[PDB]
Design a protein around this motif. Sequence first.
Motif, PDB file in Angstrom:
ATOM      1  N   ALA A  49     -59.312 154.018  56.687  1.00 13.18           N
ATOM      2  CA  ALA A  49     -58.363 153.293  55.841  1.00 13.18           C
ATOM      3  C   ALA A  49     -57.803 152.066  56.563  1.00 13.18           C
ATOM      4  O   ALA A  49     -57.799 150.948  56.020  1.00 13.18           O
ATOM      5  CB  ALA A  49     -57.233 154.225  55.405  1.00 13.18           C
ATOM      6  N   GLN A  50     -57.343 152.253  57.803  1.00 11.22           N
ATOM      7  CA  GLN A  50     -56.789 151.135  58.565  1.00 11.22           C
ATOM      8  C   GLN A  50     -57.849 150.073  58.833  1.00 11.22           C
ATOM      9  O   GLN A  50     -57.557 148.870  58.816  1.00 11.22           O
ATOM     10  CB  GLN A  50     -56.193 151.627  59.884  1.00 11.22           C
ATOM     11  CG  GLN A  50     -55.536 150.529  60.709  1.00 11.22           C
ATOM     12  CD  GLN A  50     -56.500 149.835  61.652  1.00 11.22           C
ATOM     13  OE1 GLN A  50     -57.598 150.326  61.911  1.00 11.22           O
ATOM     14  NE2 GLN A  50     -56.102 148.671  62.151  1.00 11.22           N
ATOM     15  N   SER A  52     -60.438 149.333  56.943  1.00 12.25           N
ATOM     16  CA  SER A  52     -60.611 148.559  55.720  1.00 12.25           C
ATOM     17  C   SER A  52     -59.492 147.540  55.559  1.00 12.25           C
ATOM     18  O   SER A  52     -59.744 146.374  55.222  1.00 12.25           O
ATOM     19  CB  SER A  52     -60.670 149.491  54.510  1.00 12.25           C
ATOM     20  OG  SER A  52     -60.624 148.755  53.300  1.00 12.25           O
ATOM     21  N   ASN A  53     -58.248 147.956  55.817  1.00 11.36           N
ATOM     22  CA  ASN A  53     -57.122 147.030  55.690  1.00 11.36           C
ATOM     23  C   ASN A  53     -57.274 145.831  56.625  1.00 11.36           C
ATOM     24  O   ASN A  53     -57.170 144.670  56.198  1.00 11.36           O
ATOM     25  CB  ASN A  53     -55.811 147.763  55.969  1.00 11.36           C
ATOM     26  CG  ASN A  53     -55.279 148.484  54.752  1.00 11.36           C
ATOM     27  OD1 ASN A  53     -55.822 148.353  53.656  1.00 11.36           O
ATOM     28  ND2 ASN A  53     -54.213 149.254  54.937  1.00 11.36           N
ATOM     29  N   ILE A  54     -57.522 146.097  57.909  1.00 13.09           N
ATOM     30  CA  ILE A  54     -57.593 145.015  58.886  1.00 13.09           C
ATOM     31  C   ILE A  54     -58.807 144.133  58.624  1.00 13.09           C
ATOM     32  O   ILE A  54     -58.752 142.912  58.814  1.00 13.09           O
ATOM     33  CB  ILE A  54     -57.580 145.573  60.323  1.00 13.09           C
ATOM     34  CG1 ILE A  54     -57.361 144.442  61.330  1.00 13.09           C
ATOM     35  CG2 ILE A  54     -58.857 146.336  60.641  1.00 13.09           C
ATOM     36  CD1 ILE A  54     -55.941 143.924  61.368  1.00 13.09           C
ATOM     37  N   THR A  55     -59.917 144.725  58.174  1.00 14.22           N
ATOM     38  CA  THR A  55     -61.098 143.936  57.850  1.00 14.22           C
ATOM     39  C   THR A  55     -60.810 142.978  56.706  1.00 14.22           C
ATOM     40  O   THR A  55     -61.137 141.788  56.782  1.00 14.22           O
ATOM     41  CB  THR A  55     -62.266 144.860  57.500  1.00 14.22           C
ATOM     42  OG1 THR A  55     -62.727 145.520  58.685  1.00 14.22           O
ATOM     43  CG2 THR A  55     -63.411 144.067  56.889  1.00 14.22           C
ATOM     44  N   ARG A  56     -60.175 143.477  55.641  1.00 14.81           N
ATOM     45  CA  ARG A  56     -59.827 142.606  54.524  1.00 14.81           C
ATOM     46  C   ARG A  56     -58.935 141.460  54.986  1.00 14.81           C
ATOM     47  O   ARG A  56     -59.208 140.287  54.695  1.00 14.81           O
ATOM     48  CB  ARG A  56     -59.136 143.411  53.423  1.00 14.81           C
ATOM     49  CG  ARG A  56     -60.054 144.343  52.654  1.00 14.81           C
ATOM     50  CD  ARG A  56     -59.356 144.886  51.418  1.00 14.81           C
ATOM     51  NE  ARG A  56     -59.310 146.343  51.405  1.00 14.81           N
ATOM     52  CZ  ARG A  56     -59.382 147.085  50.308  1.00 14.81           C
ATOM     53  NH1 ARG A  56     -59.502 146.536  49.110  1.00 14.81           N
ATOM     54  NH2 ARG A  56     -59.330 148.409  50.416  1.00 14.81           N
ATOM     55  N   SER A  57     -57.876 141.783  55.736  1.00 15.42           N
ATOM     56  CA  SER A  57     -56.931 140.749  56.153  1.00 15.42           C
ATOM     57  C   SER A  57     -57.607 139.699  57.029  1.00 15.42           C
ATOM     58  O   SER A  57     -57.491 138.491  56.777  1.00 15.42           O
ATOM     59  CB  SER A  57     -55.751 141.384  56.888  1.00 15.42           C
ATOM     60  OG  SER A  57     -55.192 140.480  57.825  1.00 15.42           O
ATOM     61  N   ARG A  60     -60.251 137.544  55.086  1.00 13.74           N
ATOM     62  CA  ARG A  60     -59.628 136.582  54.184  1.00 13.74           C
ATOM     63  C   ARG A  60     -59.020 135.421  54.960  1.00 13.74           C
ATOM     64  O   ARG A  60     -59.240 134.252  54.620  1.00 13.74           O
ATOM     65  CB  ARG A  60     -58.570 137.274  53.326  1.00 13.74           C
ATOM     66  CG  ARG A  60     -57.702 136.315  52.527  1.00 13.74           C
ATOM     67  CD  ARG A  60     -57.347 136.897  51.170  1.00 13.74           C
ATOM     68  NE  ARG A  60     -56.015 136.498  50.731  1.00 13.74           N
ATOM     69  CZ  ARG A  60     -55.707 136.163  49.485  1.00 13.74           C
ATOM     70  NH1 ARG A  60     -56.616 136.165  48.524  1.00 13.74           N
ATOM     71  NH2 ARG A  60     -54.456 135.817  49.197  1.00 13.74           N
TER      72      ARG A  60
ATOM     73  N   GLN B 171     -53.454 149.839  68.058  1.00 15.30           N
ATOM     74  CA  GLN B 171     -53.936 150.686  66.971  1.00 15.30           C
ATOM     75  C   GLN B 171     -54.439 152.017  67.509  1.00 15.30           C
ATOM     76  O   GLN B 171     -54.149 153.078  66.944  1.00 15.30           O
ATOM     77  CB  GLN B 171     -55.041 149.974  66.190  1.00 15.30           C
ATOM     78  CG  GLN B 171     -55.145 150.401  64.732  1.00 15.30           C
ATOM     79  CD  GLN B 171     -55.918 151.696  64.552  1.00 15.30           C
ATOM     80  OE1 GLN B 171     -56.660 152.121  65.437  1.00 15.30           O
ATOM     81  NE2 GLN B 171     -55.744 152.331  63.400  1.00 15.30           N
TER      82      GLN B 171
END
Lengths: 68, 271, 68
Positions: A49-50, A52-57, A60, B171
Amino acid sequence: GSVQPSRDRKDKITDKIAYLKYKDPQSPKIEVLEQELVRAEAESLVAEAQLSNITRSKLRAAFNYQFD
Amino acid sequence: MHRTYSLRNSRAPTASQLQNPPPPPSTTKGRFFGKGGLAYSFRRSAAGAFGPELSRKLSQLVKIEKNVLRSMELTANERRDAAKQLSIWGLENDDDVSDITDKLGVLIYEVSELDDQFIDRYDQYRLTLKSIRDIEGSVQPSRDRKDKITDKIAYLKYKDPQSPKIEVLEQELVRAEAESLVAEAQLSNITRSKLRAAFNYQFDSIIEHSEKIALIAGYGKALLELLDDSPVTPGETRPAYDGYEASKQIIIDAESALNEWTLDSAQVKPT
Amino acid sequence: GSVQPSRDRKDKITDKIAYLKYKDPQSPKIEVLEQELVRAEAESLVAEAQLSNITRSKLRAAFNYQFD
């Protein structure tokens, strides 16, 4: 690439648990290995989950900068 | 412990100690390391050196418990041999003496076999302790990794606060911390459960063994009552012995009572 | 002793099924091996029943003859 080894450990430990269960279902290591598998799984799903979040941010932001 | 508030390494006499003076200390207390040898001590020290730090104490406990079980089985076998050879000595004696010592040998044989059963239960409890040792010592490396990674994060922050590895290491520290606090919670839960179950089993075995041994002792004293302790005057003949049937029924009743004993049948009532 | 190999085959096939399931849970041989395990099990439990019956009968008859 540093979050990958978490899933690597999860896969290794689940393979080890399956092999131990097949070889000796009553082995004492089954319970401790099962706890460790649970622990890596709690380590791994939410790590996905984390990731995916960091990859998206990051994707972008980097591509917006590049296109600007 | 029975010690009252005094510097004395002596305790106030109890009702049993008030009834009669305590016997003098055993004459077999020789001078040595206090344990007999050195190989088991080397094993215990190895358990106290090589194992993981937080599991080292429990591994040592398991090793010492194994030593205790070994000594208990050895002394049970020796008590069995002692009973056998005591009855062997009592064979060539008075017929009443022969019968009484033979029945006492059987009673000590029962005591030895009950000791063996209690030893099996004690080893089951030791195996439960080994299991809790295993799970807790395998959960220790999670906190080991947490400590290592937090030390690495502190060192990296001091060396280079703007290093790109700071975010990924942070992290990872979060992830090990989520791995570790709740692992401590689970460890506490499993430790409580395993300890309670193992000690309940051990104490049930202890009370069962104690009650069976107490019944054996009571029957043995009642059977000793059968023995004719009246001395015969010098030069007289030997009175005929007729206690075969009475001891016959006594040992029959002892076996029946041992079969009849249940956990609920225990008559010990703590207050 | 001739009814023993039925249980021997049952044990061998259940060990093979466990090993195959551990090695490859999606292997096509799993279903056919499972049918064969069922079949040996139907062959084996009721064979144990018949063995108990024949053992009781033969033992009683032989020992009655011997004691007579």
